[model samples]
Target: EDPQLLVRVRGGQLRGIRLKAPGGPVSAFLGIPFAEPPVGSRRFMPPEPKRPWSGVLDATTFQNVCYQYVDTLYPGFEGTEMWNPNRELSEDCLYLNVWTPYPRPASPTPVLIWIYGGGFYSGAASLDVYDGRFLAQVEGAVLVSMNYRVGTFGFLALPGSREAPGNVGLLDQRLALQWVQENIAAFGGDPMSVTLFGESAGAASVGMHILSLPSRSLFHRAVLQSGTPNGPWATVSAGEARRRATLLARLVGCNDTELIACLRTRPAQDLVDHEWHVLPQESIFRFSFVPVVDGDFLSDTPEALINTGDFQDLQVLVGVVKDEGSYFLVYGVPGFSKDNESLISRAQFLAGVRIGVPQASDLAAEAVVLHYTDWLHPEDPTHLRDAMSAVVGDHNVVCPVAQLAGRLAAQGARVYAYIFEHRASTLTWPLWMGVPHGYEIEFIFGLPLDPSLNYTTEERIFAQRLMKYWTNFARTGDPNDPRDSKSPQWPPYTTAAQQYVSLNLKPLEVRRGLRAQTCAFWNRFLPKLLSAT
Candidate 1:
């Protein structure tokens, strides 16, 4: 351990480890507390600033991950890879980790603060795949990942009460950003040039933060991967939040007034055990607890805010997986399998589409199924599954994200969008599940499933280019310069020209109007349906 890795910040002196990378040695400061433990009275409350520590704090290992009950009891669960937490669980998990190539660079480095995605219920910063050493070393940027409370502990809202308002998790994230602003300079990071990036729910958090006034000055640029606050699963109303909270209190044996106190006294596992039962196992987006429109942090729905031009004017990079909804159908909705779609019906497809477009009328739902149906391949049963996945994926992720990009672009904000079409060689699943959700994560972090297995030439090139694009955006807001031959010039997204970079194995290509017909249908009719009684 080098003495140079020991850096002092607001909380205390932290002793971090130096990690060897291809470029050089990177300093990793892990498990540094950013806020007080969310236990006892702190439970269901906004995070408080961490108290100062007396001695040199050991920031070597990761702190305990947030408590979440991912169903691991049965073997061979499809989405287990996304939900499994490698660290122990605790309510005291409001810590953050930082990685930098230099402990004290001559000039401050651009920082990338990553937020993990687990449907706003299950996620942690300790996952090996989220390690920031390689990105920091190669990109010459500082990387930070922080933990926030999840599920009821973070989102339970008691409407009409000052004690427990919703969105503690989002508030926790805001506090983490404030911490970075206050202390990241000590570790050679430019607080003024921070970029907030994440996948799925994490991406949604970035979008929410973009709309939030408190988060205005904390971040400069934003990277949203396969998520936005406009999605059905991203947010709920205060009444919905309160309804869930009341149900949870009734299940756990607590009165309306004494609910939060009783929940605080319960064991962490008890809460996790109940959380699993909140949503039906068949639901695609199984998020019973999530950020709510508390009339404070999130004053209005993201769509309303965007329509009213109530958002920060930050450069944004957003995109979605080619087949984001394949994972959702892998398990739930009986009779659907990867290879066989004989048992899958148009009704079943419509049901899944309904999950993606919650407030759509029956006509709108029928329109989605009609538009996405692969008429060219009518005889092939696999096409049915493909068509349904396309509908769900586009409706849930691709279209909504495209709408966000369009809204931002219309407001004269710089926006760059992409379609991740590269399917990894490690994917053993059916080819129909094209570039399943979260696949870009491996390429972004350069984290392959097996380290010993050699990557295909194309895979290596793709990962290298992807990181360059991401890091370049973080550094200068523009992904590529016309003069540089390092990569293709990724054009900004605009309402007039709906073009986006198609990320493939070979040299990237600029594609025009991805799923234009389908997106056009939804953009016109879906919001109208949502606004209807």
Candidate 2:
């Protein structure tokens, strides 16, 4: 047996990763493959099973990232960077990495499979912020992060698309979970104790998993950050998905009924550049290229199914950041630097409810008063900033997340909700963006980033509290249950209790009324007008 080489996989042998330089007590083996390349004819189809080979596969180097629409795969990207740095574009990118705490497998450890998010068009498990060494070495949990198809490669669907329709990306995720069930035990992880977690688009995928019949026995629990299946993006009817697909085919100059071979033969970058034809400004809310409600895989709308308790019995920890829409306030809106008309349209876009400019301005004025009333006049620079933040905040994150939590709570399932209040420098920097979307990821994984650009020491401690709360939930379908040597008493959420871990510089419960406040505003302000209309 080779001492330097730990084990042989399919392609090449992997060198044992030393925990400490020279001679360290701990060791690991990273970047183990779980599936074959979903390239060529398999690009838009269901994931193919990994082929076996006699020789060892070299896992020392990371695999190519799944196709991304942007330059960087890191969290909190602001759209200005080069698209997908460090790795070139490749169709053969279905892969995952592994990190083991033990030099050799002795006892089974709890496992955590991570999925990154970028609106389903971007994000990769290999992002530097997702380094799993600490989660594996210190927490003693086997950490695994896997890549899945995205954007045009993962979600495009036309009239005569593949047999699976538009859910290939979701299928890729399911296959990754199955891979863990089969091989995680070899890396000191208990297949049955796996917790699937993600933020934003990743979290949305997790919520969809629970609703899908394919994932009934794959995972035990889930941690969803900032997104859910009930939101507008969760699932769409087949007709809508096909409508978008037709436009994409035209943009790429491919016949709508073209077989997999012809579509797969096209260059990936060209497809992305032309995808905007299918995904216009209006397509952001309704995913033009996303998992759809096809009867085969995504049988029904997640909200309808999850509300009826169609999903497997699993504990869920759901929450969003306090200022998640701050990033959108700064970036999603265009030509609104000082124009009231542009600003009002931006607010209407986020609320998902259309109204005349006068009425829209009235509601915007109310929100401006409530959240940033004290800032200045409506035209004041600071007031406009705060108002923009609230407009995006209320619709995109605040309402959707709180509503989903309450919906699940009504189902009598054990649910814990939170609002990450600890604003980080990455978000707060540029000072214009409040608590930007995706800023909570560094804290969620407890990884180091630029202090001035990310989480602070206080935020890190809060992250520990969150990690403890999360791992406890993963171990036993209850975040409230005691799992560690030291952890605070986490109570389940209820309308009466409104109990939630408000993650900030510290974790605590703020108010149960905050949840009801939005509903009240909508009812008192918007509902009556809708009835009259």
Candidate 3:
């Protein structure tokens, strides 16, 4: 209740709370609405800029997160549960939060805006994993995170219909960025120095914003953690988006004649609850609704946009973990989760491939299995299990990220790439599993900074170093800070070297061509197989 915590913005005056941090104190303005709540009649429509409130808005506590069912997918699994939102669920969720040093800097500080990843179907900025206080402390920058719409509520694309234009979730994000551009100054942030960063689907959102023509000027830098718009599962065509929306409406007993009208009649959660049934087997993940190439938000396919040099001017930082697909093997595929890995037969691995990539030809599938099969012990079930995860990892995330980094570096944008090689000292999964998706989030957020969290001594040191790298990239385009004598120089990714840092504690050394041959298959050779007669 400090009087100094009351800050004024275009929306209204907000009374935020001051947090006691290890690095001193940070002022956190939580759950500030940036857009008009997209609910009731406004559910599927584009997000409208929030009108100013009459009096001081109380933003002390976190607010409602967007409606999404985590239980429908992982079902109480600890590996995934760490990210679920603690706040109440509501469709009227378009809030954004801000964190800045308590004693504001004399000059405006750089801004780092974060977007959460839950594929395109699930995620919330309210989740504790995305809390920006520690990052705000370690980095002399203003941190912002927004709860954008997801699942059917945000992506129901009806091409011809005015009611649901699609990719409104992205619309929510753009508006949030716009909010930053307009009001960040009041929070001691420089509008010109905004950096957009996200992980997984959140990373894809960053990719979309980078490619978005309207969003081109909103931010100056980008970070893609294990995802990009060019990934196989990132986007769907306009026709496919409409097809899924109609299918969901039909499943909910709505007449197909008027898709949006029938959808508006049902409760919001029902839409998300029933989403698992949409192309259930065909989708890479359980929940099928994802971003669509709405004629408006995305002008062309992601590849086409990249080919046209739409993202050439943006400074990009992208990376993936060593075992990106290990988590997917357990959760993405059916039997891998509940059953023992030793029990999985060879035939089951091939069948899992079919479910993941339904369009792959028999030849393509065979090639994929052959390429990823663990060579040292091909028949060993444990090795075979690792092989299946590699296939999922390569095709779904790892290769796509490598190709994106290559494309950006080749096209003249300064791109910094890293492969997170370190696993957490305390992991919910088995020790044998490789560093999987989202393994670096806690480190980036500086979980080790909070000694009470019980992070290992080595983990704390590594986390500090990780924050320096991330924040340094945000302050300037480069990840290295010349002021810190102990810091190492991270070279820019080049088409020749394909250089990327193996993010480990001992030596954050530069490495070349991570999974180079494997990515070549995914980026080039596999496409050839799909195209061949």
Model 1, range 104-197, lDDT digits (tens) per residue?
5669999999999988888898886687877877777799999988888777778557667889899889999999999999988999899999
Best by lDDT: 3
On TM-score, the leading prediction is 3
* TM-score per candidate: 0.93, 0.83, 0.96
Candidate 2, residue 44: Cα displacement in angstroms equals 1.0
Q: Which sequence of candidate numbers ranks them by lDDT, best first?
A: 3, 1, 2
Tell how far residue 497 is off in model 3, in angstroms: 1.2
lDDT of each: 0.81, 0.64, 0.83
Candidates 1 and 2 compared by TM-score, better number? 1
Q: Write the per-residue lDDT of candidate 3 for residues 95-150, one digit (tens) a residue.
A: 99999988765689999999998887777887767879998777766999999998
**Model 3, residue 195: C-alpha shift (Å):** 0.4
